Amino acid sequence: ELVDPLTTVREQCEQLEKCVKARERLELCDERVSSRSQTEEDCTEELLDFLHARDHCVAHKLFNSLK
Amino acid sequence: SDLELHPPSYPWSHRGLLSSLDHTSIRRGFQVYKQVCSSCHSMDYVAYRHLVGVCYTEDEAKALAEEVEVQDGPNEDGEMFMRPGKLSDYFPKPYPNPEAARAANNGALPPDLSYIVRARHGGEDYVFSLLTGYCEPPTGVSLREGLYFNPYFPGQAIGMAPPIYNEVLEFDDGTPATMSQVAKDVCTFLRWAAEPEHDHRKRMGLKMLLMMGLLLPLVYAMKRHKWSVLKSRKLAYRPPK
Amino acid sequence: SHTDIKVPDFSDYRRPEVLDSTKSSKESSEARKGFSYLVTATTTVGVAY
Amino acid sequence: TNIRKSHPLMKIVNNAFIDLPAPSNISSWWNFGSLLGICLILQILTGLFLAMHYTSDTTTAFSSVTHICRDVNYGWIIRYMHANGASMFFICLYMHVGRGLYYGSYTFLETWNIGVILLLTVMATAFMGYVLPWGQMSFWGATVITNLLSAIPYIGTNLVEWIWGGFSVDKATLTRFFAFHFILPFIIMAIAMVHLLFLHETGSNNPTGISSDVDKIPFHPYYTIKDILGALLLILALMLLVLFAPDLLGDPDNYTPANPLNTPPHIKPEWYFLFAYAILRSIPNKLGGVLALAFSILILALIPLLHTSKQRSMMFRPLSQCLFWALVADLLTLTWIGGQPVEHPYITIGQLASVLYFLLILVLMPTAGTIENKLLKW
Amino acid sequence: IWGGFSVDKATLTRFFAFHFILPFIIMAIAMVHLLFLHETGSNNPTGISSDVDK
Amino acid sequence: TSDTTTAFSSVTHICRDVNYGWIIRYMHANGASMFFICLYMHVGRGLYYGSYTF
Amino acid sequence: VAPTLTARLYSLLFRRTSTFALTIVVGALFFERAFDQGADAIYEHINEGKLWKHIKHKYEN
Amino acid sequence: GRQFGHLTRVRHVITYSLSPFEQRAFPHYFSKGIPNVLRRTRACILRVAPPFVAFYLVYTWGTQEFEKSKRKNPA
Ligand SMILES: CCCCCCCCCCCCCCCCCC(=O)OC[C@H](COP(=O)(O)OCCN)OC(=O)CCCCCCCCCCCCC
Ligand SMILES: CCCCCCCCCCCCCC(=O)OC[C@H](COP(=O)([O-])OCC[N+](C)(C)C)OC(=O)CCCCCCCCCCCCC
Ligand code: HEC
Ligand code: HEM
Ligand code: HEM
Ligand code: HEM
Ligand SMILES: CO/C=C(/C(=O)OC)c1ccccc1Oc1cc(Oc2ccccc2C#N)ncn1
Numbered sequence: 001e002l003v004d005p006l007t008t009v010r011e012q013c014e015q016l017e018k019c020v021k022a023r024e025r026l027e028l029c030d031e032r033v034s035s036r037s038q039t040e041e042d043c044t045e046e047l048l049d050f051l052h053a054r055d056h057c058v059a060h061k062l063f064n065s066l067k
Numbered sequence: 068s069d070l071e072l073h074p075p076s077y078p079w080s081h082r083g084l085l086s087s088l089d090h091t092s093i094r095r096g097f098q099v100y101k102q103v104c105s106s107c108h109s110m111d112y113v114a115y116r117h118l119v120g121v122c123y124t125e126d127e128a129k130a131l132a133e134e135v136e137v138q139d140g141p142n143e144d145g146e147m148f149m150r151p152g153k154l155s156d157y158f159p160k161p162y163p164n165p166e167a168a169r170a171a172n173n174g175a176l177p178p179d180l181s182y183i184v185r186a187r188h189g190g191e192d193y194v195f196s197l198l199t200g201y202c203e204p205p206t207g208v209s210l211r212e213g214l215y216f217n218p219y220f221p222g223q224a225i226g227m228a229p230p231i232y233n234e235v236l237e238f239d240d241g242t243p244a245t246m247s248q249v250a251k252d253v254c255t256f257l258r259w260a261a262e263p264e265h266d267h268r269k270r271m272g273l274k275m276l277l278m279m280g281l282l283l284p285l286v287y288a289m290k291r292h293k294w295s296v297l298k299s300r301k302l303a304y305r306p307p308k
Numbered sequence: 309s310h311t312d313i314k315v316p317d318f319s320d321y322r323r324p325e326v327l328d329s330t331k332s333s334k335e336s337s338e339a340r341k342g343f344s345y346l347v348t349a350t351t352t353v354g355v356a357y
Numbered sequence: 358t359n360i361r362k363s364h365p366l367m368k369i370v371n372n373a374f375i376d377l378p379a380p381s382n383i384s385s386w387w388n389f390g391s392l393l394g395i396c397l398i399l400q401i402l403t404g405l406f407l408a409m410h411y412t413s414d415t416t417t418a419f420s421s422v423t424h425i426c427r428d429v430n431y432g433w434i435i436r437y438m439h440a441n442g443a444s445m446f447f448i449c450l451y452m453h454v455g456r457g458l459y460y461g462s463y464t465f466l467e468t469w470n471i472g473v474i475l476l477l478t479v480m481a482t483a484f485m486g487y488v489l490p491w492g493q494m495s496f497w498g499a500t501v502i503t504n505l506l507s508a509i510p511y512i513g514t515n516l517v518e519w520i521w522g523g524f525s526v527d528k529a530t531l532t533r534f535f536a537f538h539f540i541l542p543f544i545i546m547a548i549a550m551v552h553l554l555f556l557h558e559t560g561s562n563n564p565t566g567i568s569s570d571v572d573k574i575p576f577h578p579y580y581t582i583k584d585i586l587g588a589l590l591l592i593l594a595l596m597l598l599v600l601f602a603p604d605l606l607g608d609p610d611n612y613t614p615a616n617p618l619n620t621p622p623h624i625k626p627e628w629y630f631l632f633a634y635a636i637l638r639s640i641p642n643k644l645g646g647v648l649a650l651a652f653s654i655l656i657l658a659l660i661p662l663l664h665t666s667k668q669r670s671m672m673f674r675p676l677s678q679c680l681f682w683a684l685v686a687d688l689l690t691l692t693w694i695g696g697q698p699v700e701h702p703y704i705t706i707g708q709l710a711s712v713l714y715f716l717l718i719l720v721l722m723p724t725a726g727t728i729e730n731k732l733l734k735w
Numbered sequence: 736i737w738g739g740f741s742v743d744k745a746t747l748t749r750f751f752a753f754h755f756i757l758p759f760i761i762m763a764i765a766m767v768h769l770l771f772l773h774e775t776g777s778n779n780p781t782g783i784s785s786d787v788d789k
Numbered sequence: 790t791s792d793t794t795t796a797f798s799s800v801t802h803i804c805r806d807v808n809y810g811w812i813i814r815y816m817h818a819n820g821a822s823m824f825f826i827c828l829y830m831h832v833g834r835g836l837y838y839g840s841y842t843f
Numbered sequence: 844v845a846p847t848l849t850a851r852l853y854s855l856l857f858r859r860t861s862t863f864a865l866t867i868v869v870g871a872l873f874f875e876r877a878f879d880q881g882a883d884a885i886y887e888h889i890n891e892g893k894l895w896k897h898i899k900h901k902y903e904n
Numbered sequence: 905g906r907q908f909g910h911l912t913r914v915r916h917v918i919t920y921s922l923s924p925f926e927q928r929a930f931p932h933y934f935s936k937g938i939p940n941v942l943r944r945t946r947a948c949i950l951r952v953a954p955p956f957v958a959f960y961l962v963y964t965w966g967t968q969e970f971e972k973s974k975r976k977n978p979a
Contacts (some may be wrong), residue, residue, distance in 0.1 A: 292929045304916060
């Protein structure tokens with residue numbers, strides 16, 4: 001209904017070199033923990049590293065479009 | 068003892084050393100607190116009169132105070148009663164005490180927001196990132212009902228459902244109420260709420276730097292002036308032989 | 309023997325108006341004193357503010 | 358003859374600030390004497406003006422402080438001056454003490470030992486001041502420190518419960534800390550006058566450690582203007598913190614009211630106590646931590662007894678200079694460790710730095726002065 | 736001096752602060768009170784100098 | 790405590806609950822009166838015997 | 844060339860200490876207005892459109 | 905206290921002094937000043953620098969070892 005500038009520029013940060021490298025390390029963890037459903041390992045570490053690299057790019061460009 | 072995610076630094080317009088708050092964004096941010104946040108969060112240390120000459124006129128702030136009812140009394144019969152708000156009233160508390168608050172929020176306690184920007188590491192960078200940072204739990208994390216995954220919150224499990232979203236309110240000046248906009252405006256207002264002296268200290272800070280840039284070399288020159296008697300003195304030793 | 313005592317040369321330290329040993333120092337006394345006291349007056353004007 | 362010299366009142370001011378023979382070569386490290394005097398006065402003025410609006414009761418102690426920064430005219434500038442003035446106080450104290458170690462000023466026994474008493478009472482003053490706003494760190498900082506006194510054998514609990522006025526940090530503890538935080542700065546100022554009484558008996562040391570009676574200058578105008586300039590730099594440093602970063606040195610937890618049930622995650626002191634907080638947590642034993650924590654400051658009273666060098670100042674002692682800066686960097690390590698959680702590898706580093714602190718002062722630095730004597734053949 | 740328009744909360748608090756600070760200012764002035772006294776010594780009931788009998 | 794809502798009752802709290810608070814308060818209130826007894830004798834001594842010449 | 848400005852400033856204003864003080868207290872009066880006026884103009888310019896006095900006209904009546 | 909005229913004994917020492925209103929308060933401030941500051945630092949840099957560098961190494965290692973200790977391993 002509305003175009004939130006966050007989600008639009010989020011996709012611009014996701015398609016960067018250092019961000020995609022962190023995604024596949026999480027997807028490797030998403031495939032690691034779902035396979036053997038007998039463990040207690042979680043993929044929190046691989047997610048926060050992805051968010052750390054993504055949101056650093058978001059902060060540099062987001063505020064140029066808002067009032 | 069969990070993993071931590073620290074917030075990045077957003078380029079707020081009040082970040083710079085001499086940079087004031089944006090008072091139009093303050094005005095919009097108050098509307099977010101009133102419409103969205105005030106139903107769960109108190110702000111016990113801000114009163115309607117503090118708005119006057121910051122983001123609303125006196126007449127505007129009076130009309131705003133009169134939109135709520137507050138308790139007063141006793142009257143001559145010893146009874147409490149309700150009257151319209153005035154400029155001197157503090158913002159209504161949503162709950163009489165924290166025990167009622169926990170019961171209304173699945174056992175969690177929404178903190179007072181008067182000082183939230185100053186009471187949390189990262190300030191508005193943290194608050195902005197929390198509100199706008201919700202996402203699905205990673206694989207292998209299953210939170211009990213009542214709690215919500217938020218990677219910026221300590222422990223990553225927060226008892227507050229996402230409170231803002233597109234078109235959560237309409238702004239008086241027509242600004243598109245996107246989630247990021249709403250977060251940005253409410254964070255700016257909360258900075259003002261926690262540090263109303265923000266703009267004035269920077270104005271003072273500028274005058275202090277200018278006066279120091281004058282007075283320091285002049286006072287230095289006075290020091291060197293007096294000391295020059297000593298700094299250029301010459302000694303000679305003439306013992307009898 | 310005290311007639312051997314010459315005063316050392318302060319040319320490295322003297323102000324420009326006081327370099328010439330054949331020109332009277334009275335010609336620049338008011339200007340030199342005025343400058344250092346203008347520094348003091350401006351300093352007091354700053355602290356007063 | 359001269360009114361300034363013969364009047365009973367002016368002769369004390371004259372023989373202290375005007376005609377005092379002072380060395381011609383004392384450097385900027387001698388400015389911190391007057392700056393400490395200014396900080397003490399500055400803390401008393403702002404401290405008094407805060408007491409006209411602060412209330413020492415738990416139900417309003419937190420909000421009375423809020424009332425100052427919001428409603429009181431220029432209350433916010435008066436508070437942050439007080440909070441940051443305390444930090445500037447401790448900057449100057451540590452430069453002031455370090456100047457005395459490096460240059461040998463501790464050989465003035467009476468002046469130095471009264472200085473140690475001044476350091477302790479200023480620390481006790483700031484410790485009680487931090488309790489008054491009654492924030493999270495105000496409460497829990499008071500809890501973890503006062504609980505150390507229970508480790509004293511056979512009178513521990515009775516002493517702790519007497520200082521508390523109950524069974525924990527509570528209403529009675531908050532009120533008396535305000536009274537003690539009020540009385541002490543005047544007791545401090547009186548001891549600072551005795552600090553000067555013993556000093557003027559001998560005059561100042563100088564960077565060389567050699568007597569300067571052959572070359573003295575009057576304190577006025579040479580060091581009146583030099584202390585004024587130094588005081589101007591002090592106001593620059595203070596106002597930069599007050600007007601551009603008033604929350605840099607403070608902890609955000611203190612902006613949350615006290616809560617005896619909910620504990621903050623990381624209980625860290627102000628920066629000027631981190632070195633001693635690290636020494637406390639590096640010792641596993643409880644009573645041993647208190648003794649080491651008290652010995653961390655009382656060791657200063659032993660430096661005159663551990664002076665081995667035939668020379669007074671470290672200016673002509675390279676092997677002692679290196680050990681002196683090893684003490685600073687080791688103290689900068691304890692400061693760093695103090696603001697970090699008690700986990701690997703900070704536990705081991707904090708223990709090494711703690712032993713290195715007492716080893717440098719008790720063993721290594723005295724031994725260097727003896728080696729230096731042999732190299733000069735005396 | 737009131738901090739308002741009458742004796743009120745602001746008047747009560749500052750009076751406590753002033754009632755605290757003054758007795759120490761008093762004690763310091765009492766030391767100067769003795770400084771000037773010892774310059775001359777005490778008077779006596781006769782008003783005659785007592786240097787001949789101290 | 791220097792607040793109107795508890796200034797009166799904090800004084801009451803001393804004379805009732807605090808150990809030997811009542812003896813400490815009345816010493817303070819009557820000590821002030823003894824202070825003024827001594828002050829007036831002290832001043833009157835100075836007028837009668839001429840000590841004001843200092 | 845007549846004597847420099849600093850020379851006429853000395854003999855006319857700074858020689859007597861009383862006029863030296865009158866110069867300072869009068870110089871303090873005009874310096875305060877000129878410095879506060881100019882300094883505020885720098886603060887508002889750097890923060891154009893953000894302070895309340897800029898958005899004040901929108902909510903007149 | 906100590907007074908001028910009662911400090912110590914000095915003989916055969918002459919001192920020449922210039923009035924401050926006849927000399928510059930900043931004589932060769934950058935010409936001689938900057939070479940003298942380089943000399944003053946070079947003569948003391950080897951006394952002060954190593955321990956603060958040793959701290960900077962411990963500070964850097966201990967902060968690296970701290971973060972990598974809590975990160976998970978395949979075990
Ligand atoms: C107990 C509390 C713990 C708290 C921890 C606080 C963190 C510490 C942060 C470190 C800041 C360091 C300050 C800057 C040091 C500059 C030193 C310098 O410029 O060079 C060496 C200088 C040489 O000068 P000389 O007099 O020997 O000869 C001069 C002839 N041109 O020699 C000198 O000028 C040295 C004079 C002494 C300076 C004192 C600084 C140390 C402060 C802490 C000491 C605490 C002791 C218990
Ligand atoms: C109730 C209302 C009352 C309001 C009254 C307002 C009055 C304002 C001030 C005016 C008085 C000036 C007096 C004066 O001018 O005589 C002081 C002295 C003279 O100066 P001079 O030696 O050139 O001799 C002068 C030689 N002639 C005269 C031949 C040129 O001035 C100096 O020397 C000292 C100047 C240095 C300033 C810094 C001192 C402040 C303390 C430290 C601040 C920082 C930390 C707290
Ligand atoms: C009820 C429907 C709420 C609404 C509307 C808002 N908040 Fe909230 N908040 C709520 C709860 C139950 C909690 C406690 C969470 C917990 O697990 O303790 C909170 C907490 C916060 C916090 C504190 C986060 C922290 O670091 O401790 C903040 C900063 C916060 N909430 C912000 C906030 C804002 C800006 C809101 C309006 C947009 C808002 N909340 C609304 C419940 C509710
Ligand atoms: C409120 C606290 C203090 C104040 C206000 C104060 C003030 C002063 C002043 C004004 C001087 C003379 C000027 C100077 O040397 O800079 C001085 C000298 C001195 N002080 Fe302090 N001081 C305090 C605490 C201390 C402490 C904590 C110590 C050491 C433990 C100490 C030790 C000394 C010594 C040894 C001297 C003589 C220095 C010399 O002559 O070179 N003082 N102090
Ligand atoms: C050596 C002198 C002093 C030191 C080092 C000192 C230090 C401190 C510090 C660090 C605080 C904490 C402030 C904060 O965190 O907000 C504080 C609080 C306080 N102090 Fe002091 N102080 C001194 C003198 C005084 C004096 C003399 C008074 C009273 C006349 C006073 C009154 C207060 C009050 C009322 C508070 C609570 C208000 C507040 O927290 O800002 N102080 N003090
Ligand atoms: C806190 C207030 C005061 C204290 C603690 C105090 C204390 C003293 C002391 C101990 C003496 C010497 C012993 C004696 O003469 O009894 C003295 C003498 C004296 N006082 Fe006070 N005094 C105070 C106030 C006053 C006042 C209000 C006056 C008069 C207006 C005054 C006038 C004198 C005089 C004239 C002397 C010399 C008496 C003599 O030598 O015969 N003093 N005071
Ligand atoms: C009331 O707590 C105050 C604190 C503070 O830093 O005040 C300035 C504090 C806060 C959190 C934790 C502890 C705190 O207090 C302290 C107090 C403290 O006092 C000492 C300082 C030096 C040497 C010994 C001691 C002791 N005991 N050493 C360390 N922390």
